[PDB]
């Protein structure tokens, strides 16, 4: 997260860190047994870490649970990033309380102009590299699909939205991948891609989660 702020310990209780010997991606807890992240976060050997603030210190509210199964969306396209979404099942159910909590799925999509909360342990610099230990947060508005298409020279589908600041300076970044965009208490997005971070006319792009609720619900119901 570039140009954001320290969230505060456990203030984003659905935020997870995916760990393979080190933090590599974020995710969102959607019930006691399932996390949603980005398909581009797929790898084997995933441990889900819940209840994290400082990812380098055991502070006492963590739950570390191995993944039993990962399911990348059947139509994920790694060249265009279309359908950048993956479900991860936990080997055991997480214990839910104030510091570890699921985030509601949307019943309708979010509108352009709404300020949403984006969070992660990604790079905090637009030019350099600096990775934080504690969770960072950013409020950013959803931009119109037309604005997003005007800015970018890459493929943008109806399964993506963009959010952020066309002037630059505030954005998600590498290491925030897979993490949440929450708007009015609903998980509306997954950190998916961007041309650099916080650069002028290169906003963040996000998987448009509202398009996937049926797939999420049926996949969970049958697995
Ligand atoms: C859509 C498409 N097919 N394409 C072609 C390939 C391009 O891939 C690039 C281009 C560039 C570039 O410099 O232009 C960079 C720079 C970086 C690092 C060093 C920061 N990465 C890795 C990265 C990883 C995750 C991110 C997650 C989120 C956001 C964000 N801004 N919200 C940025 C992210 C950036 C990049 C990935 C993207 C456009
Ligand atoms: Ca910790």
PDB file of C-alpha atoms and ligand atoms in Angstrom:
ATOM      1  CA  UNK A   1       0.000   0.000   0.000  1.00  0.00           C
ATOM      2  CA  UNK A   2       1.553   3.284  -1.158  1.00  0.00           C
ATOM      3  CA  UNK A   3       0.392   6.526   0.497  1.00  0.00           C
ATOM      4  CA  UNK A   4      -1.841   4.789   3.027  1.00  0.00           C
ATOM      5  CA  UNK A   5      -1.875   4.638   6.834  1.00  0.00           C
ATOM      6  CA  UNK A   6      -1.323   2.142   9.617  1.00  0.00           C
ATOM      7  CA  UNK A   7      -4.596   0.295  10.041  1.00  0.00           C
ATOM      8  CA  UNK A   8      -4.184  -0.498  13.719  1.00  0.00           C
ATOM      9  CA  UNK A   9      -3.878  -4.052  15.093  1.00  0.00           C
ATOM     10  CA  UNK A  10      -6.753  -6.366  14.095  1.00  0.00           C
ATOM     11  CA  UNK A  11      -8.937  -3.516  12.819  1.00  0.00           C
ATOM     12  CA  UNK A  12      -9.297  -5.447   9.533  1.00  0.00           C
ATOM     13  CA  UNK A  13     -10.217  -8.799  11.058  1.00  0.00           C
ATOM     14  CA  UNK A  14     -11.016 -10.565   7.730  1.00  0.00           C
ATOM     15  CA  UNK A  15      -7.552  -9.725   6.290  1.00  0.00           C
ATOM     16  CA  UNK A  16      -5.271 -12.763   5.968  1.00  0.00           C
ATOM     17  CA  UNK A  17      -1.611 -13.198   5.100  1.00  0.00           C
ATOM     18  CA  UNK A  18      -0.740 -16.176   2.827  1.00  0.00           C
ATOM     19  CA  UNK A  19       2.630 -17.536   3.920  1.00  0.00           C
ATOM     20  CA  UNK A  20       5.010 -19.914   2.139  1.00  0.00           C
ATOM     21  CA  UNK A  21       8.017 -19.364   4.416  1.00  0.00           C
ATOM     22  CA  UNK A  22       7.353 -15.613   4.085  1.00  0.00           C
ATOM     23  CA  UNK A  23       4.303 -13.392   3.396  1.00  0.00           C
ATOM     24  CA  UNK A  24       3.557 -13.448  -0.360  1.00  0.00           C
ATOM     25  CA  UNK A  25      -0.078 -12.441  -0.773  1.00  0.00           C
ATOM     26  CA  UNK A  26      -3.176 -11.274   1.023  1.00  0.00           C
ATOM     27  CA  UNK A  27      -6.636 -12.869   1.201  1.00  0.00           C
ATOM     28  CA  UNK A  28     -10.049 -12.358   2.801  1.00  0.00           C
ATOM     29  CA  UNK A  29     -11.731 -14.702   5.240  1.00  0.00           C
ATOM     30  CA  UNK A  30     -15.307 -15.381   4.024  1.00  0.00           C
ATOM     31  CA  UNK A  31     -16.342 -18.015   6.538  1.00  0.00           C
ATOM     32  CA  UNK A  32     -14.689 -20.127   9.224  1.00  0.00           C
ATOM     33  CA  UNK A  33     -13.263 -22.499   6.550  1.00  0.00           C
ATOM     34  CA  UNK A  34     -12.664 -20.491   3.337  1.00  0.00           C
ATOM     35  CA  UNK A  35     -10.477 -17.636   2.161  1.00  0.00           C
ATOM     36  CA  UNK A  36     -10.785 -15.808  -1.138  1.00  0.00           C
ATOM     37  CA  UNK A  37      -7.601 -14.516  -2.808  1.00  0.00           C
ATOM     38  CA  UNK A  38      -6.239 -13.810  -6.307  1.00  0.00           C
ATOM     39  CA  UNK A  39      -5.583 -16.618  -8.823  1.00  0.00           C
ATOM     40  CA  UNK A  40      -2.198 -15.028  -9.519  1.00  0.00           C
ATOM     41  CA  UNK A  41      -1.397 -15.817  -5.850  1.00  0.00           C
ATOM     42  CA  UNK A  42      -1.689 -19.556  -6.554  1.00  0.00           C
ATOM     43  CA  UNK A  43       1.187 -21.760  -5.327  1.00  0.00           C
ATOM     44  CA  UNK A  44       1.489 -24.942  -3.294  1.00  0.00           C
ATOM     45  CA  UNK A  45       2.601 -25.036   0.345  1.00  0.00           C
ATOM     46  CA  UNK A  46       0.231 -22.277   1.578  1.00  0.00           C
ATOM     47  CA  UNK A  47      -0.289 -21.538   5.259  1.00  0.00           C
ATOM     48  CA  UNK A  48      -3.085 -19.081   6.000  1.00  0.00           C
ATOM     49  CA  UNK A  49      -2.290 -16.632   8.833  1.00  0.00           C
ATOM     50  CA  UNK A  50      -5.273 -15.017  10.500  1.00  0.00           C
ATOM     51  CA  UNK A  51      -5.303 -12.462  13.270  1.00  0.00           C
ATOM     52  CA  UNK A  52      -2.086 -10.817  12.040  1.00  0.00           C
ATOM     53  CA  UNK A  53      -0.857  -7.328  12.553  1.00  0.00           C
ATOM     54  CA  UNK A  54       2.946  -7.505  12.692  1.00  0.00           C
ATOM     55  CA  UNK A  55       3.762 -10.392  10.339  1.00  0.00           C
ATOM     56  CA  UNK A  56       7.276 -10.779  11.862  1.00  0.00           C
ATOM     57  CA  UNK A  57       6.251 -10.961  15.545  1.00  0.00           C
ATOM     58  CA  UNK A  58       3.959 -13.379  17.343  1.00  0.00           C
ATOM     59  CA  UNK A  59       1.686 -10.891  19.150  1.00  0.00           C
ATOM     60  CA  UNK A  60      -0.843 -13.356  20.523  1.00  0.00           C
ATOM     61  CA  UNK A  61      -3.962 -13.166  18.333  1.00  0.00           C
ATOM     62  CA  UNK A  62      -2.779 -15.197  15.360  1.00  0.00           C
ATOM     63  CA  UNK A  63      -4.225 -18.390  13.993  1.00  0.00           C
ATOM     64  CA  UNK A  64      -1.985 -20.347  11.605  1.00  0.00           C
ATOM     65  CA  UNK A  65      -3.874 -22.920   9.512  1.00  0.00           C
ATOM     66  CA  UNK A  66      -2.645 -24.873   6.475  1.00  0.00           C
ATOM     67  CA  UNK A  67      -4.681 -24.944   3.239  1.00  0.00           C
ATOM     68  CA  UNK A  68      -6.320 -28.310   2.413  1.00  0.00           C
ATOM     69  CA  UNK A  69      -7.338 -27.299  -1.136  1.00  0.00           C
ATOM     70  CA  UNK A  70      -6.913 -24.420  -3.525  1.00  0.00           C
ATOM     71  CA  UNK A  71      -9.319 -23.773  -6.387  1.00  0.00           C
ATOM     72  CA  UNK A  72      -8.284 -21.281  -9.082  1.00  0.00           C
ATOM     73  CA  UNK A  73     -11.302 -19.959 -11.074  1.00  0.00           C
ATOM     74  CA  UNK A  74     -12.028 -22.350 -13.996  1.00  0.00           C
ATOM     75  CA  UNK A  75     -11.612 -19.441 -16.439  1.00  0.00           C
ATOM     76  CA  UNK A  76      -8.585 -17.662 -14.967  1.00  0.00           C
ATOM     77  CA  UNK A  77      -6.446 -16.234 -17.778  1.00  0.00           C
ATOM     78  CA  UNK A  78      -2.884 -15.557 -16.607  1.00  0.00           C
ATOM     79  CA  UNK A  79      -2.103 -13.425 -19.720  1.00  0.00           C
ATOM     80  CA  UNK A  80      -5.019 -10.954 -19.342  1.00  0.00           C
ATOM     81  CA  UNK A  81      -5.720 -11.453 -15.675  1.00  0.00           C
ATOM     82  CA  UNK A  82      -9.425 -12.046 -16.451  1.00  0.00           C
ATOM     83  CA  UNK A  83     -11.121 -13.989 -13.596  1.00  0.00           C
ATOM     84  CA  UNK A  84      -8.275 -13.359 -11.106  1.00  0.00           C
ATOM     85  CA  UNK A  85      -9.850 -15.164  -8.175  1.00  0.00           C
ATOM     86  CA  UNK A  86      -9.079 -18.295  -6.152  1.00  0.00           C
ATOM     87  CA  UNK A  87     -10.668 -20.031  -3.169  1.00  0.00           C
ATOM     88  CA  UNK A  88      -8.619 -21.627  -0.424  1.00  0.00           C
ATOM     89  CA  UNK A  89     -10.087 -24.148   2.020  1.00  0.00           C
ATOM     90  CA  UNK A  90      -8.528 -24.349   5.510  1.00  0.00           C
ATOM     91  CA  UNK A  91      -7.554 -27.732   6.995  1.00  0.00           C
ATOM     92  CA  UNK A  92      -9.521 -26.781  10.091  1.00  0.00           C
ATOM     93  CA  UNK A  93     -12.111 -24.136  10.921  1.00  0.00           C
ATOM     94  CA  UNK A  94     -10.857 -20.815  12.242  1.00  0.00           C
ATOM     95  CA  UNK A  95     -12.185 -19.600  15.584  1.00  0.00           C
ATOM     96  CA  UNK A  96     -14.183 -16.435  14.995  1.00  0.00           C
ATOM     97  CA  UNK A  97     -14.074 -13.558  17.617  1.00  0.00           C
ATOM     98  CA  UNK A  98     -13.439  -9.704  17.331  1.00  0.00           C
ATOM     99  CA  UNK A  99      -9.916 -10.036  15.900  1.00  0.00           C
ATOM    100  CA  UNK A 100     -10.678 -12.846  13.400  1.00  0.00           C
ATOM    101  CA  UNK A 101     -13.936 -12.373  11.481  1.00  0.00           C
ATOM    102  CA  UNK A 102     -15.413 -13.120   8.100  1.00  0.00           C
ATOM    103  CA  UNK A 103     -16.364 -10.382   5.635  1.00  0.00           C
ATOM    104  CA  UNK A 104     -19.795 -10.419   3.947  1.00  0.00           C
ATOM    105  CA  UNK A 105     -20.108 -11.145   0.214  1.00  0.00           C
ATOM    106  CA  UNK A 106     -22.018  -8.505  -1.832  1.00  0.00           C
ATOM    107  CA  UNK A 107     -25.586  -8.896  -3.071  1.00  0.00           C
ATOM    108  CA  UNK A 108     -25.094  -6.024  -5.517  1.00  0.00           C
ATOM    109  CA  UNK A 109     -22.055  -4.417  -7.148  1.00  0.00           C
ATOM    110  CA  UNK A 110     -20.489  -1.166  -5.909  1.00  0.00           C
ATOM    111  CA  UNK A 111     -20.780   2.150  -7.765  1.00  0.00           C
ATOM    112  CA  UNK A 112     -18.135   4.537  -9.080  1.00  0.00           C
ATOM    113  CA  UNK A 113     -17.284   7.231  -6.499  1.00  0.00           C
ATOM    114  CA  UNK A 114     -17.708   4.980  -3.417  1.00  0.00           C
ATOM    115  CA  UNK A 115     -14.660   5.094  -1.092  1.00  0.00           C
ATOM    116  CA  UNK A 116     -13.548   1.548  -0.260  1.00  0.00           C
ATOM    117  CA  UNK A 117     -10.948   0.188   2.179  1.00  0.00           C
ATOM    118  CA  UNK A 118      -7.938  -1.580   0.626  1.00  0.00           C
ATOM    119  CA  UNK A 119      -5.390  -3.270   2.906  1.00  0.00           C
ATOM    120  CA  UNK A 120      -2.186  -5.283   2.817  1.00  0.00           C
ATOM    121  CA  UNK A 121       1.488  -5.788   3.664  1.00  0.00           C
ATOM    122  CA  UNK A 122       2.679  -4.846   0.174  1.00  0.00           C
ATOM    123  CA  UNK A 123       5.366  -2.366  -0.953  1.00  0.00           C
ATOM    124  CA  UNK A 124       4.837   1.156   0.409  1.00  0.00           C
ATOM    125  CA  UNK A 125       6.994   2.937  -2.214  1.00  0.00           C
ATOM    126  CA  UNK A 126       6.175   3.955  -5.802  1.00  0.00           C
ATOM    127  CA  UNK A 127       9.787   4.068  -6.969  1.00  0.00           C
ATOM    128  CA  UNK A 128      11.815   2.298  -4.293  1.00  0.00           C
ATOM    129  CA  UNK A 129      11.100  -0.840  -2.316  1.00  0.00           C
ATOM    130  CA  UNK A 130      10.040  -0.886   1.356  1.00  0.00           C
ATOM    131  CA  UNK A 131       7.907  -3.609   2.960  1.00  0.00           C
ATOM    132  CA  UNK A 132       6.033  -2.935   6.191  1.00  0.00           C
ATOM    133  CA  UNK A 133       5.669  -5.273   9.114  1.00  0.00           C
ATOM    134  CA  UNK A 134       2.234  -4.016  10.209  1.00  0.00           C
ATOM    135  CA  UNK A 135      -0.969  -3.908   8.142  1.00  0.00           C
ATOM    136  CA  UNK A 136      -1.454  -0.788   6.014  1.00  0.00           C
ATOM    137  CA  UNK A 137      -4.773   0.639   4.850  1.00  0.00           C
ATOM    138  CA  UNK A 138      -5.922   2.987   2.073  1.00  0.00           C
ATOM    139  CA  UNK A 139      -9.238   4.583   1.233  1.00  0.00           C
ATOM    140  CA  UNK A 140      -9.731   4.828  -2.501  1.00  0.00           C
ATOM    141  CA  UNK A 141     -12.705   5.560  -4.790  1.00  0.00           C
ATOM    142  CA  UNK A 142     -13.952   3.206  -7.487  1.00  0.00           C
ATOM    143  CA  UNK A 143     -13.439   4.928 -10.845  1.00  0.00           C
ATOM    144  CA  UNK A 144     -15.834   4.688 -13.790  1.00  0.00           C
ATOM    145  CA  UNK A 145     -15.112   1.867 -16.248  1.00  0.00           C
ATOM    146  CA  UNK A 146     -14.655   4.541 -18.961  1.00  0.00           C
ATOM    147  CA  UNK A 147     -12.012   6.378 -16.880  1.00  0.00           C
ATOM    148  CA  UNK A 148     -10.211   3.148 -16.207  1.00  0.00           C
ATOM    149  CA  UNK A 149     -10.162   2.266 -19.941  1.00  0.00           C
ATOM    150  CA  UNK A 150      -9.023   5.741 -20.941  1.00  0.00           C
ATOM    151  CA  UNK A 151      -5.939   5.421 -18.716  1.00  0.00           C
ATOM    152  CA  UNK A 152      -4.619   1.935 -19.542  1.00  0.00           C
ATOM    153  CA  UNK A 153      -3.020   0.264 -22.565  1.00  0.00           C
ATOM    154  CA  UNK A 154      -3.842  -3.216 -21.205  1.00  0.00           C
ATOM    155  CA  UNK A 155      -6.920  -5.430 -21.409  1.00  0.00           C
ATOM    156  CA  UNK A 156      -9.776  -4.515 -19.084  1.00  0.00           C
ATOM    157  CA  UNK A 157     -12.769  -6.799 -18.815  1.00  0.00           C
ATOM    158  CA  UNK A 158     -16.216  -6.580 -17.182  1.00  0.00           C
ATOM    159  CA  UNK A 159     -14.719  -8.736 -14.405  1.00  0.00           C
ATOM    160  CA  UNK A 160     -12.346  -5.927 -13.347  1.00  0.00           C
ATOM    161  CA  UNK A 161     -12.785  -2.514 -11.832  1.00  0.00           C
ATOM    162  CA  UNK A 162     -10.200   0.134 -11.115  1.00  0.00           C
ATOM    163  CA  UNK A 163      -9.930   2.330  -8.046  1.00  0.00           C
ATOM    164  CA  UNK A 164      -7.539   4.952  -6.828  1.00  0.00           C
ATOM    165  CA  UNK A 165      -6.064   8.300  -7.807  1.00  0.00           C
ATOM    166  CA  UNK A 166      -5.163   9.180 -11.377  1.00  0.00           C
ATOM    167  CA  UNK A 167      -2.746  11.871 -10.130  1.00  0.00           C
ATOM    168  CA  UNK A 168      -0.684   9.089  -8.512  1.00  0.00           C
ATOM    169  CA  UNK A 169       0.655   8.774  -4.974  1.00  0.00           C
ATOM    170  CA  UNK A 170      -1.910   6.395  -3.429  1.00  0.00           C
ATOM    171  CA  UNK A 171      -2.457   2.784  -4.548  1.00  0.00           C
ATOM    172  CA  UNK A 172      -2.118  -0.865  -3.667  1.00  0.00           C
ATOM    173  CA  UNK A 173       1.124  -2.582  -4.774  1.00  0.00           C
ATOM    174  CA  UNK A 174       3.109  -5.807  -5.136  1.00  0.00           C
ATOM    175  CA  UNK A 175       2.593  -7.930  -1.985  1.00  0.00           C
ATOM    176  CA  UNK A 176      -0.964  -6.575  -1.570  1.00  0.00           C
ATOM    177  CA  UNK A 177      -2.083  -9.063  -4.290  1.00  0.00           C
ATOM    178  CA  UNK A 178      -5.071 -11.212  -3.314  1.00  0.00           C
ATOM    179  CA  UNK A 179      -6.123  -8.807  -0.560  1.00  0.00           C
ATOM    180  CA  UNK A 180      -9.505  -7.120   0.103  1.00  0.00           C
ATOM    181  CA  UNK A 181     -11.316  -4.092  -1.233  1.00  0.00           C
ATOM    182  CA  UNK A 182     -14.264  -3.531   1.112  1.00  0.00           C
ATOM    183  CA  UNK A 183     -17.035  -1.058   0.349  1.00  0.00           C
ATOM    184  CA  UNK A 184     -19.948  -0.382   2.736  1.00  0.00           C
ATOM    185  CA  UNK A 185     -19.200  -3.572   4.658  1.00  0.00           C
ATOM    186  CA  UNK A 186     -19.075  -5.876   1.594  1.00  0.00           C
ATOM    187  CA  UNK A 187     -16.097  -7.536  -0.056  1.00  0.00           C
ATOM    188  CA  UNK A 188     -16.271  -6.014  -3.560  1.00  0.00           C
ATOM    189  CA  UNK A 189     -12.699  -6.496  -4.814  1.00  0.00           C
ATOM    190  CA  UNK A 190      -9.453  -8.458  -4.855  1.00  0.00           C
ATOM    191  CA  UNK A 191      -6.104  -6.735  -5.426  1.00  0.00           C
ATOM    192  CA  UNK A 192      -5.262  -7.946  -8.960  1.00  0.00           C
ATOM    193  CA  UNK A 193      -2.925  -5.773 -11.021  1.00  0.00           C
ATOM    194  CA  UNK A 194      -1.436  -2.426 -11.915  1.00  0.00           C
ATOM    195  CA  UNK A 195       1.234  -0.801 -14.068  1.00  0.00           C
ATOM    196  CA  UNK A 196       3.739  -0.066 -11.323  1.00  0.00           C
ATOM    197  CA  UNK A 197       2.187   1.468  -8.197  1.00  0.00           C
ATOM    198  CA  UNK A 198       0.829   4.919  -7.467  1.00  0.00           C
ATOM    199  CA  UNK A 199       1.976   6.219 -10.875  1.00  0.00           C
ATOM    200  CA  UNK A 200       0.097   8.932 -12.760  1.00  0.00           C
ATOM    201  CA  UNK A 201      -2.713   7.550 -14.946  1.00  0.00           C
ATOM    202  CA  UNK A 202      -2.010   4.007 -13.860  1.00  0.00           C
ATOM    203  CA  UNK A 203      -4.670   3.186 -11.214  1.00  0.00           C
ATOM    204  CA  UNK A 204      -5.030  -0.111  -9.340  1.00  0.00           C
ATOM    205  CA  UNK A 205      -7.111  -2.898 -10.910  1.00  0.00           C
ATOM    206  CA  UNK A 206      -9.251  -5.259  -8.877  1.00  0.00           C
ATOM    207  CA  UNK A 207     -11.230  -8.437  -9.490  1.00  0.00           C
ATOM    208  CA  UNK A 208     -14.912  -7.476  -9.533  1.00  0.00           C
ATOM    209  CA  UNK A 209     -16.091  -9.910  -6.832  1.00  0.00           C
ATOM    210  CA  UNK A 210     -19.823  -9.257  -7.255  1.00  0.00           C
ATOM    211  CA  UNK A 211     -19.615 -11.183 -10.572  1.00  0.00           C
ATOM    212  CA  UNK A 212     -18.461 -14.318  -8.728  1.00  0.00           C
ATOM    213  CA  UNK A 213     -20.819 -14.762  -5.792  1.00  0.00           C
ATOM    214  CA  UNK A 214     -22.736 -17.694  -7.400  1.00  0.00           C
ATOM    215  CA  UNK A 215     -19.445 -19.465  -8.206  1.00  0.00           C
ATOM    216  CA  UNK A 216     -18.144 -18.811  -4.679  1.00  0.00           C
ATOM    217  CA  UNK A 217     -21.328 -20.072  -2.991  1.00  0.00           C
ATOM    218  CA  UNK A 218     -21.707 -23.259  -5.116  1.00  0.00           C
ATOM    219  CA  UNK A 219     -17.993 -24.081  -4.841  1.00  0.00           C
ATOM    220  CA  UNK A 220     -18.101 -23.810  -1.041  1.00  0.00           C
ATOM    221  CA  UNK A 221     -21.378 -25.788  -0.871  1.00  0.00           C
ATOM    222  CA  UNK A 222     -19.861 -28.742  -2.793  1.00  0.00           C
ATOM    223  CA  UNK A 223     -16.371 -28.812  -1.258  1.00  0.00           C
TER     224      UNK A 223
HETATM  225  C1  LIG B   1      -2.761  -6.060 -17.305  1.00  0.00           C
HETATM  226  C2  LIG B   1      -1.510  -6.587 -17.938  1.00  0.00           C
HETATM  227  N1  LIG B   1      -1.624  -7.698 -18.696  1.00  0.00           N
HETATM  228  N2  LIG B   1      -0.312  -5.870 -17.833  1.00  0.00           N
HETATM  229  C3  LIG B   1       0.942  -6.404 -18.423  1.00  0.00           C
HETATM  230  C4  LIG B   1       1.895  -6.704 -17.248  1.00  0.00           C
HETATM  231  C5  LIG B   1       2.030  -5.476 -16.303  1.00  0.00           C
HETATM  232  O1  LIG B   1       2.788  -5.945 -15.173  1.00  0.00           O
HETATM  233  C6  LIG B   1       3.536  -5.058 -14.432  1.00  0.00           C
HETATM  234  C7  LIG B   1       4.030  -3.838 -14.901  1.00  0.00           C
HETATM  235  C8  LIG B   1       4.806  -3.026 -14.068  1.00  0.00           C
HETATM  236  C9  LIG B   1       5.331  -1.691 -14.588  1.00  0.00           C
HETATM  237  O2  LIG B   1       6.359  -1.227 -14.077  1.00  0.00           O
HETATM  238  O3  LIG B   1       4.653  -1.096 -15.476  1.00  0.00           O
HETATM  239  C10 LIG B   1       5.059  -3.468 -12.762  1.00  0.00           C
HETATM  240  C11 LIG B   1       5.853  -2.844 -11.630  1.00  0.00           C
HETATM  241  C12 LIG B   1       5.685  -3.911 -10.574  1.00  0.00           C
HETATM  242  C13 LIG B   1       6.343  -3.878  -9.194  1.00  0.00           C
HETATM  243  C14 LIG B   1       7.862  -3.630  -9.338  1.00  0.00           C
HETATM  244  C15 LIG B   1       5.680  -2.830  -8.343  1.00  0.00           C
HETATM  245  N3  LIG B   1       4.928  -4.899 -11.024  1.00  0.00           N
HETATM  246  C16 LIG B   1       4.492  -6.090 -10.249  1.00  0.00           C
HETATM  247  C17 LIG B   1       3.108  -5.856  -9.563  1.00  0.00           C
HETATM  248  C18 LIG B   1       2.510  -6.925  -8.877  1.00  0.00           C
HETATM  249  C19 LIG B   1       1.276  -6.783  -8.233  1.00  0.00           C
HETATM  250  C20 LIG B   1       0.625  -5.562  -8.246  1.00  0.00           C
HETATM  251  C21 LIG B   1      -0.620  -5.389  -7.607  1.00  0.00           C
HETATM  252  C22 LIG B   1      -1.263  -4.168  -7.556  1.00  0.00           C
HETATM  253  C23 LIG B   1      -0.722  -3.036  -8.196  1.00  0.00           C
HETATM  254  C24 LIG B   1      -1.367  -1.792  -8.141  1.00  0.00           C
HETATM  255  N4  LIG B   1      -0.757  -0.731  -8.725  1.00  0.00           N
HETATM  256  N5  LIG B   1      -2.573  -1.606  -7.578  1.00  0.00           N
HETATM  257  C25 LIG B   1       0.586  -3.136  -8.948  1.00  0.00           C
HETATM  258  C26 LIG B   1       1.203  -4.493  -8.932  1.00  0.00           C
HETATM  259  C27 LIG B   1       2.454  -4.617  -9.563  1.00  0.00           C
HETATM  260  C28 LIG B   1       4.545  -4.683 -12.294  1.00  0.00           C
HETATM  261  C29 LIG B   1       3.796  -5.475 -13.137  1.00  0.00           C
HETATM  262  C30 LIG B   1       0.675  -4.951 -15.803  1.00  0.00           C
HETATM  263  C31 LIG B   1      -0.198  -4.617 -17.012  1.00  0.00           C
HETATM  264 CA1  LIG B   2       2.136 -11.559  14.104  1.00  0.00          CA
END
